[PDB]
Paper text:
Our subsequent investigation of one gene cluster (Rv3093c-Rv3095) associated with ethionamide resistance that contained a putative monooxygenase/repressor pair with some resemblance to ethA/ethR, indicates that [name] is likely a flavin-dependent monooxygenase that sulfoxygenates ethionamide, and Rv3095 is its transcriptional regulator. Ethionamide is a second-line anti-tubercular drug used to treat patients infected with multi-drug-resistant or extensively drug-resistant isolates, and is a pro-drug that requires metabolic activation before it can exert its cytotoxic effects. To investigate the mechanism of ethionamide sulfoxygenation by [name], we solved protein crystal structures of apo-[name], and [name] in complex with FMN ([name]-FMN) and ethionamide ([name]-FMN-ETH), at resolutions of 1.91 Å, 2.00 Å, and 1.64 Å, respectively. All three crystals contained one tetramer per asymmetric unit, tetramers being formed by two homodimers, the C-terminal domain primarily mediating interactions between the two monomers.
Author numbering: 6 to 248, 255 to 376
Amino acid sequence: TEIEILAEKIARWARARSAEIERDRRLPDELVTRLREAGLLRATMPREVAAPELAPGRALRCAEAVARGDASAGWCVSIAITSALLVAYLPARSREEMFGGGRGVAAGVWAPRGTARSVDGGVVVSGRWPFCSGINHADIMFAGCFVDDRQVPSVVALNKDELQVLDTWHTLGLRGTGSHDCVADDVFVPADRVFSVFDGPIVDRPLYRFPVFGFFALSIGAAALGNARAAIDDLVELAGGKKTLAERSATQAAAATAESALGAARALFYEVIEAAWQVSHDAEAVPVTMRNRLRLAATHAVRTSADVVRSMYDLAGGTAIYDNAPLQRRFRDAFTATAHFQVNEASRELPGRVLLDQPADVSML
């Protein structure tokens, strides 16, 4: 069957529904079903819950291919396969309750915005989390919080049932991601469903040795990269018959600059994923040096993708300002992705610390 091939087929479906995806701020049910049937929304869950436990380079290649069809759809894949890693941090019994037998699609917001009081058998958590991508089609939301007075934050596995989904996702781009805010109000969480990411996974296999904050950052890079490739596709198709635009010296120098910039960002992206994947098979934890390279490459990929899409948009000139032009949505989507905290310009400083052998807190690298 081959999941990469299914990803490319689903990308073409996402492209054909892209007007409706943006209009409704959500993926159509038929597209969620395709994604679910191909295993893409649970690809990185462990084999014990009937899931592919797909290697991370393959999973990220799948996210990128769907993003080339539609950036919001690919982003949904990115967040679902990142969230799905946390299924490996649940004790066997709550894992089987929420995800057993092919069940459960996860969303996740890592920021520790909740406050959790400890009680008999569990905790009581309240808080509000912005930018919950995929909450429209997920069952479970992993959310970060502080438990009692601890200074190391925790994660609680909430059911969408007990949450209030507010209609707040009115944004420049990535509209289909429906990344609304979610509110918990005195929700009880059994102990079964509270953990620290910093204690490591219950399932101790290579996919879960792969750095989990690195993977999060890389999945945004994958969606950005797939969006940018689609923008170059759009410009090349326009330039042949616009009068021509293609026959003109600045256009080809710019097309050449963009193609080599994107190719170079893409090549570094997969080179560092493959190198970290190899050492994820070794006894010791993946070193800080390797984790540093994953974050460098993720940020570079998102920022280069934005530069590339901006250049294509600019070359299209008067065509791309109109709502019916494909480059306009790529532009809007690319400059929503650059705002994410895992891959913004500020995320260059800590990985620069490491490079310069300076004292650094690398707990979330």
